[PDB]
């Protein structure tokens, strides 16, 4: 019982784009851009669509970098998050009622204001490693258990 989500990191040689979510799921935290995959839509097409919706940016090729499954205790559905990165975008990041984008130098990624699991897998993304992870959460702040391994094929 899992539901598909996407997550896109615009990762350039010296900086990464994140968005401050203003409401709803994950509000108040910096995040990549993504959301639910639609009926009849490929995961990658969903990732490209959500990047545009949430950041205003157009991406062509997206590179698969990981899969992370999230369990929230007390919630039936697991989140099956397909993570992608890109270094070539078009457009300029757009602030909307839903998200405030902002570039971060790689040594200044705001982990204290991000979901706590990101501290584990972001360093792999930064070194161009691919991964499979699982995180069991209680609430939005507490990781009860996790696994995380590097893979050759996402
Ligand atoms: N970047 C990111 N980390 C997350 N952790 C748990 C749920 C959703 C998440 N999005």
Please, what CATH class does the domain formed by 1-154 belong to? Answer: alpha beta
CB 40 within 8 A of CB 17: no
Nearest to 33 by CA among 78, 94, 75: 94
User: How many residues can be counted in the chain?
Assistant: 154
**Token digits of residue 26:** 């994950």
Q: What is the DSSP letter of 106?
A: G
Give the integer Cα–Cα distance in Å for 67 and 150: 10
Cα dihedral 18, 19, 24, 25 in deg (nearest 10): 0
**Which residue has its alpha carbon closest to ligand 1 atom 8?**
115
CB 102 within 8 A of CB 23: no
CA of 40 to the centre of ligand 1 (A): 24
75 burial via Cβ count (<10 Å: 0-12, 13-18, 19+) = exposed
Q: Given the CA of residue 26, which atom of ligand 1 is nearest to it?
A: 8
Residues with CB under 6 A from ligand 1: 7, 31-32, 70, 115, 117-118
What was the resolution (in A) of this experimentally determined structure?
Answer: 1.2
Q: How was this structure determined?
A: X-ray
Nearest to 54 by CA among 79, 77, 25, 14: 25
Give the integer Cα–Cα distance in Å for 125 and 48: 18
Residue 1 neighbours by CB under 8 Å, 6+ apart? 76, 77, 78
CA of 118 to the centre of ligand 1 (A): 7
**Token digits of residue 148:** 């995380």
**Which residue has its alpha carbon closest to ligand 1 atom 6?**
115
């Amino acid at each position: 019982a899992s539901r598909l989500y996407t997550l896109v990191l615009v990762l350039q040689p010296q900086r990464v784009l994140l968005g401050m979510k203003k409401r709803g799921a994950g509000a108040g935290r910096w995040n990549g851009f993504g959301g639910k995959v639609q009926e009849g839509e490929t995961i990658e097409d969903g990732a490209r669509r959500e990047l545009q919706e949430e950041s205003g940016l157009t991406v062509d090729a997206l590179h698969k970098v990981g899969q992370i499954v999230f369990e929230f205790v007390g919630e039936p559905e697991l989140m099956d998050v397909h993570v992608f990165c890109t270094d070539s975008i078009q457009g300029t990041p757009v602030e909307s009622d839903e998200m405030r984008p902002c570039w971060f130098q790689l040594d200044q990624i705001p982990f204290k204001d991000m979901w706590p699991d990101d501290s584990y897998w972001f360093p792999l993304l930064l070194q161009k490693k691919k991964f499979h992870g699982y995180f069991k959460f209680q609430g939005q702040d507490t990781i009860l258990d996790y696994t995380l391994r590097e893979v050759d094929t996402v």
